[PDB]
Amino acid sequence: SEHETRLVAKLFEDYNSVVRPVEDHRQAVEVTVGLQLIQLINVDEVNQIVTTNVRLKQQWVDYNLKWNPDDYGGVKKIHIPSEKIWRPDLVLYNNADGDFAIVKFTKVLLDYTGHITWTPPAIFKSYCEIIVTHFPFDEQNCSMKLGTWTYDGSVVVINPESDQPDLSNFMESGEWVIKESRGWKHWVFYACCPSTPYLDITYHFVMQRLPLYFIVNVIIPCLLFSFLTGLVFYLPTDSGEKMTLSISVLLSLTVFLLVIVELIPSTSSAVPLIGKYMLFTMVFVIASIIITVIVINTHHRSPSTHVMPEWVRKVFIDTIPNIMFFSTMIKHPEVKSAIEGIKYIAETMKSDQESNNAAEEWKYVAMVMDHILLAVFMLVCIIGTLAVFAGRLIELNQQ
Amino acid sequence: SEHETRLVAKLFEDYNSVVRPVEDHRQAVEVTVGLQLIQLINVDEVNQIVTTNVRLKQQWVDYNLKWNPDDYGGVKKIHIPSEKIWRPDLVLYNNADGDFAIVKFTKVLLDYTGHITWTPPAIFKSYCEIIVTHFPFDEQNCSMKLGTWTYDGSVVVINPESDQPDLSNFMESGEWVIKESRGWKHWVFYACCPSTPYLDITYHFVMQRLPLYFIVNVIIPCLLFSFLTGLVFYLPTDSGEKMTLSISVLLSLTVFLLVIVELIPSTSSAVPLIGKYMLFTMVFVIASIIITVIVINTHHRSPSTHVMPEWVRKVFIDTIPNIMFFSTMIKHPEVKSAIEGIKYIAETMKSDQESNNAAEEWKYVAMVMDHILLAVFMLVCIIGTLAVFAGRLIELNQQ
Amino acid sequence: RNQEERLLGDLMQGYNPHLRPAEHDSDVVNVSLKLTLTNLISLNEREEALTTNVWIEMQWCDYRLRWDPRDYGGLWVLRVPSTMVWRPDIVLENNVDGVFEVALYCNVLVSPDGCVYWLPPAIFRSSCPVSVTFFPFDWQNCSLIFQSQTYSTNEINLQLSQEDGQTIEWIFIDPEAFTENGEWAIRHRPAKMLLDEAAPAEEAGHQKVVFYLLIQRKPLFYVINIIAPCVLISSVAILIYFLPAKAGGQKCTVAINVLLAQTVFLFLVAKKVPETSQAVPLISKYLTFLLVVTILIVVNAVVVLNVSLRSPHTHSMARGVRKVFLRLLPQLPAIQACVEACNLIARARHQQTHFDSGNKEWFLVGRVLDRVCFLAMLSLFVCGTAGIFLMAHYNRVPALPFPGDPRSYLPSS
Amino acid sequence: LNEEERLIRHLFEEKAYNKELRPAAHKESVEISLALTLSNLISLKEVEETLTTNVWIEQGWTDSRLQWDAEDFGNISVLRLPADMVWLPEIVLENNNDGSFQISYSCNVLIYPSGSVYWLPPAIFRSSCPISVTYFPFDWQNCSLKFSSLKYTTKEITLSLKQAEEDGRSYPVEWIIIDPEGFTENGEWEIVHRPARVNVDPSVPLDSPNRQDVTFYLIIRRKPLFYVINILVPCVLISFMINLVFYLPADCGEKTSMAISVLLAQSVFLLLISKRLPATSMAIPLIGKFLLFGMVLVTMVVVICVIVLNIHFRTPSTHVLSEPVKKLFLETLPEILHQELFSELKPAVDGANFIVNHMKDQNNYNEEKDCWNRVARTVDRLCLFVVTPIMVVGTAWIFLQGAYNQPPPQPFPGDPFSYLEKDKRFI
Amino acid sequence: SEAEGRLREKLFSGYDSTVRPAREVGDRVWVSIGLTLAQLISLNEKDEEMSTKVYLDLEWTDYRLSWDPEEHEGIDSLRISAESVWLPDVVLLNNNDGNFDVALDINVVVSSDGSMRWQPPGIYRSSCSIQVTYFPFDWQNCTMVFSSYSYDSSEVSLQTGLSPEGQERQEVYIHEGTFIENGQWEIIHKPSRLIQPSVGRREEVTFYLIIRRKPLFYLVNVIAPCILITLLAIFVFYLPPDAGEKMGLSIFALLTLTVFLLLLADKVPETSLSVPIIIKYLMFTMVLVTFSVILSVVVLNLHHRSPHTHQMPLWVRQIFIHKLPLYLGLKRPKPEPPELREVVSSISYIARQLQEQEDHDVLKEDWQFVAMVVDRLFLWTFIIFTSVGTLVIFLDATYHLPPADPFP
Quick one: which of A262, A286, A260, A254 has its CA closest to A273?
Answer: A260
* C-beta separation of E162 from E169 below 8 A: yes
Half-sphere exposure of A47 (CA within 13 A, CB side): 16
Same domain, C120 and C269: no
DSSP lists the bridge partners of residue A126 as A50, A95
Tell me C392's DSSP state: H
d(C-alpha A349, C-alpha A355), whole Å: 10
Cis peptide before B136 (omega within 30 of 0): yes
d(C-alpha D393, C-alpha D387), whole Å: 10
* C-beta separation of B152 from B196 below 8 A: yes
* C-beta separation of B106 from B118 below 8 A: yes
How many other CB atoms are there within 10 angstroms of residue D312's CB atom? 23
Terminal-to-terminal C-alpha distance of chain C: 41
> Cβ contacts of residue B391 below 8 Å, gap of 6+?
none
Is residue A175 less than 8 Å (CB to CB) from chain E? yes
Cis peptide before C136 (omega within 30 of 0): yes
Q: Measured on CA atoms in the order B374, B380, B383, B389, is the torsion positive or negative? A: negative
Query: Which residues from C are below 8 Å from B174, CB to CB?
Result: 48, 129, 274-278
The class of domain A213-398 in CATH terms is mainly alpha
d(C-alpha A19, C-alpha C4), whole Å: 6
| Residue C178, CA distances (Å) to A183, A396, C120, C141, D256 in order | 21, 32, 16, 20, 62
Residue A22 burial (C-beta neighbours within 10 Å; 0-12, 13-18, 19+): buried
> Cβ contacts of residue E149 below 8 Å, gap of 6+?
A106, A107, E89, E90, E91, E93, E100
DSSP lists the bridge partners of residue A185 as A201
Query: Which residues from C are below 8 Å from B138, CB to CB?
Result: none
d(C-alpha C307, C-alpha C246), whole Å: 11
Quick one: which of D421, D162, D131, D105 has its CA closest to D281?
Answer: D131
Is residue B25 less than 8 Å (CB to CB) from chain D? yes
d(C-alpha A51, C-alpha A32), whole Å: 24
Residue C403 burial (C-beta neighbours within 10 Å; 0-12, 13-18, 19+): exposed
Q: Which domain holds residue C265?
A: 221-393
* C-beta separation of A180 from A221 below 8 A: no
What angle (nearest 5°) sits at the alpha carbon of residue A230, between those of residues A227 and A236? Answer: 130
* C-beta separation of A38 from A55 below 8 A: yes
| Closest residue, chain B, to C268 (C-alpha) | B217
Terminal-to-terminal C-alpha distance of chain B: 59
Same domain, C225 and C203: no
Radius of gyration of chain A, Cα coordinates, nearest whole angstrom: 39
| Helix, strand, coil tally for chain B in percent (to 5) | 40, 25, 30
Query: Which residues from E are below 8 Å from D279, CB to CB?
Result: 183-184, 217-218, 267
Same domain, C312 and C354: yes
> Cβ contacts of residue E173 below 8 Å, gap of 6+?
E34, E35, E36, E37, E57, E163
Same domain, E122 and E17: yes
Could you give phi then psi for residue A110, rounded to 5 degrees?
Answer: -115, 125
Same domain, E302 and E388: yes
Give me the amino acid identity at A16: N
Angle between helices B220-230 and B333-398 (to 10 degrees): 150
Query: Which residues from B are below 8 Å from C370, CB to CB?
Result: none
d(C-alpha B164, C-alpha B183), whole Å: 6
Quick one: which of A392, C66, C162, B149 has its CA closest to D120?
Answer: B149
- The answer to whether the CB atoms of B248 and C257 lie below 8 A apart is yes
Same domain, C207 and C238: no
Angle between helices C251-271 and B220-230 (to 10 degrees): 170
DSSP lists the bridge partners of residue D56 as D37, D122
> Cβ contacts of residue B17 below 8 Å, gap of 6+?
B84, B85, B86
- The answer to whether the CB atoms of A367 and E273 lie below 8 A apart is no
Same domain, C213 and C189: yes
* C-beta separation of A30 from A151 below 8 A: no
| Residue C379, CA distances (Å) to A185, C373, C375, D242 in order | 64, 10, 6, 43
Query: Which residues from D are below 8 Å from E245, CB to CB?
Result: 254-257, 309
CATH number, domain containing residue C12: 2.70.170.10
d(C-alpha B40, C-alpha B211), whole Å: 17
Residue C413 burial (C-beta neighbours within 10 Å; 0-12, 13-18, 19+): exposed
Quick one: which of C67, C61, C60 has its CA closest to C7?
Answer: C67
| Closest residue, chain E, to D316 (C-alpha) | E333
Could you give phi then psi for residue B201, rounded to 5 degrees?
Answer: -120, 120
Same domain, E192 and E53: yes
Same domain, E299 and E152: no
DSSP lists the bridge partners of residue C179 as C39
Same domain, E191 and E276: no
Does C163 map to a domain?
Answer: yes
Does E178 map to a domain?
Answer: yes
Give residues 298 to 357 of A whose Cβ lies within 8 Å of E. 325-327, 329, 335-336, 338-339, 342-343, 345-346, 349, 353
Per the entry, the structure determination technique was cryo-EM
SS3 A331: coil
Quick one: which of D67, D76, D91 has its CA closest to D5?
Answer: D76
SS3 B269: coil
d(C-alpha A307, C-alpha A355), whole Å: 11
SS3 C206: coil
Dmax of chain E from CA atoms?
154
Quick one: which of C123, C77, C87, C373 has its CA closest to C237?
Answer: C373
Residue A256, Cα to own-chain centre: how many angstroms?
15
* C-beta separation of A178 from A167 below 8 A: yes
HEC readout, chain E: CHHHHHHHHHHCCCCCCCCCCCCCCCCCEEEEEEEEEEEEEEEECCCCEEEEEEEEEEEEECHHHCCCHHHHCCCCEEEEECCCCCCCCEEECCECCCCCCCCCCCEEEEECCCEEEECCEEEEEEECCCCCCCCCCCEEEEEEEEEECCCCCCCEEEEECCCCCCCCCCECECCCCCCCCCCCEEEEECEEEEECCCCCCCCEEEEEEEEEECCHHHHHHHHHHHHHHHHHHHHHHHCCCCCCCHHHHHHHHHHHHHHHHHHHCCCCCCCCCCCCHHHHHHHHHHHHHHHHHHHHHHHHHHHCCCCCCCCCCHHHHHHHHHHHHHHHCCCCCCCCCHHHHHHHHHHHHHHHHHHHHHHHHHHHHHHHHHHHHHHHHHHHHHHHHHHHHHHHHHHHHHCCCCCCCCCC
- The answer to whether the CB atoms of C277 and B175 lie below 8 A apart is yes
The DSSP H or E segment spanning C205 is none
* C-beta separation of D171 from D424 below 8 A: yes
DSSP secondary structure, A227-277, as one string: HTTGGGGTS-GGGS-HHHHHHHHHHHHHHHHHHHHTTS---SS---HHHHH
Same domain, C251 and C130: no
In CATH terms, A2-210 corresponds, of 2.70.170.10, 1.10.260.40, 3.90.1640.30, 2.170.190.11, to: 2.70.170.10
* C-beta separation of C227 from C281 below 8 A: no
Same domain, C198 and C320: no
CATH number, domain containing residue E45: 2.70.170.10
d(C-alpha D110, C-alpha A128), whole Å: 55
d(C-alpha D92, C-alpha D86), whole Å: 17
d(C-alpha E216, C-alpha A46), whole Å: 34
> Cβ contacts of residue B314 below 8 Å, gap of 6+?
none
Compute the nearest-CA separation of D282 from chain E (Å).
6
Query: Which residues from D are below 8 Å from B89, CB to CB?
Result: 107-108
Does E407 map to a domain?
Answer: no
Quick one: which of C5, C4, C71 has its CA closest to A14?
Answer: C5
Residue D284, Cα to own-chain centre: how many angstroms?
12
Residue B318 burial (C-beta neighbours within 10 Å; 0-12, 13-18, 19+): exposed
User: How many interface pairs between A and C have CB atoms less than 8 angstroms apart?
Assistant: 210
CATH number, domain containing residue C361: 1.20.58.390
DSSP lists the bridge partners of residue E143 as E208
Give me the amino acid identity at B19: V
d(C-alpha E89, C-alpha E150), whole Å: 7
What is the residue extent of each domain of chain B? 2-210, 213-398
d(C-alpha A211, C-alpha A297), whole Å: 44
> Cβ contacts of residue D313 below 8 Å, gap of 6+?
D250, D372, E240, E242, E243
Instruction: Tell me the Ramachandran region of residue E93: left when phi exceeds 0, alpha when psi lies from -120 to 50, beta otherwise.
Output: alpha
* C-beta separation of E41 from E53 below 8 A: yes
Cis peptide before A136 (omega within 30 of 0): yes
Does E40 map to a domain?
Answer: yes
Residue D386 burial (C-beta neighbours within 10 Å; 0-12, 13-18, 19+): exposed
SS3 B215: helix
- The answer to whether the CB atoms of C1 and A63 lie below 8 A apart is yes
| Closest residue, chain E, to D203 (C-alpha) | E177
Which of D64, D317, D341 best probes binding to E when mutated, by most E CB atoms within 10 angstroms? Answer: D317
Same domain, E136 and E276: no
* C-beta separation of B335 from B328 below 8 A: no
Give me the amino acid identity at B238: D
| Residue D116, CA distances (Å) to C77, D119, D172 in order | 58, 10, 18
Same domain, C323 and C382: yes
How many other CB atoms are there within 10 angstroms of residue C375's CB atom? 11
Does C122 map to a domain?
Answer: yes
Domain boundary among E214, E232, E262: E214
- The answer to whether the CB atoms of C84 and A18 lie below 8 A apart is yes
Does E152 map to a domain?
Answer: yes
Quick one: which of A89, A87, A27, A36 has its CA closest to A60?
Answer: A87
Quick one: which of A238, E322, E197 has its CA closest to C250?
Answer: A238
The DSSP H or E segment spanning B243 is helix B242-262
Same domain, C200 and C277: no
Query: Which residues from D are below 8 Å from E121, CB to CB?
Result: 101, 150
Chains adjacent to A (≥3 CB pairs closer than 8 angstroms)? C, E
* C-beta separation of B102 from B120 below 8 A: yes
| Closest residue, chain C, to A187 (C-alpha) | C176
Query: Residue-wise over B62-88: b if at least 16 C-beta within 10 A, else e?
Result: bebbebebeebeebebbbbebeebbbb
Does E134 map to a domain?
Answer: yes
Domain boundary among C164, C196, C218: C218
d(C-alpha B92, C-alpha B83), whole Å: 20
Same domain, E206 and E297: no
Same domain, E46 and E21: yes
- The answer to whether the CB atoms of A216 and E304 lie below 8 A apart is no
Q: Which domain holds residue E185?
A: 2-214
Query: Which residues from D are below 8 Å from E240, CB to CB?
Result: 309-310, 312-313
How many other CB atoms are there within 10 angstroms of residue E1's CB atom? 17
Domain count, chain E: 2
Which of D120, D186, D248 is opposite residue B296, by nearest beta carbon? D248
Q: Measured on CA atoms in the order C13, C19, C25, C30, is the torsion positive or negative? A: positive
List own/partner pairs for D343-349 with CB under 8 A and 24 or more apart: D344/E340, D344/E344, D345/E344, D347/E344, D347/E347, D347/E348, D348/B338, D348/E343, D348/E344, D348/E347, D349/B332, D349/B334, D349/B335, D349/B337, D349/B338
SS3 B191: coil
DSSP lists the bridge partners of residue E118 as E58
Residue C318 burial (C-beta neighbours within 10 Å; 0-12, 13-18, 19+): exposed
Go through chain A and list every residue after which a break occurs, taking a C to next N gap over 2.5 angstroms, comma-separated. Answer: 329
Query: Which residues from C are below 8 Å from B123, CB to CB?
Result: 97-98
Does E254 map to a domain?
Answer: yes
Which of B91, B127, B243 is opposite residue D257, by nearest beta carbon? B243
* C-beta separation of B288 from B324 below 8 A: no
| Residue C91, CA distances (Å) to A71, B79, B268, C199 in order | 52, 17, 44, 19
Same domain, C207 and C235: no
HEC readout, chain D: CCHHHHHHHHHHHHCCCCCCCCCCCCCCCEEEEEEEEEEEEEEEECCCCEEEEEEEEEEEEECHHHCCCHHHHCCCCCEEEEHHHCCCCCEEECCECCCCCCCCCCCEEEECCCCEEEECCEEEEEEECCCCCCCCCCCEEEEEEEEEECCCCCCCEEEEECEEEECCEEEECCECECCCCCCECCCCEEEEECEEEEEECCCCCCCCCCCEEEEEEEEEEECCHHHHHHHHHHHHHHHHHHHHHHHCCCCCCCHHHHHHHHHHHHHHHHHHHHCCCCCCCCCCCHHHHHHHHHHHHHHHHHHHHHHHHHHHCCCCCCCCCCHHHHHHHHHHHHHHHCCHHHHCCHHHHHHHHHHHHHHHHHHHHHHHHHHHHHHHHHHHHHHHHHHHHHHHHHHHHHHHHHHCCCCCCCCCCCCCCCCCHHHCCCC
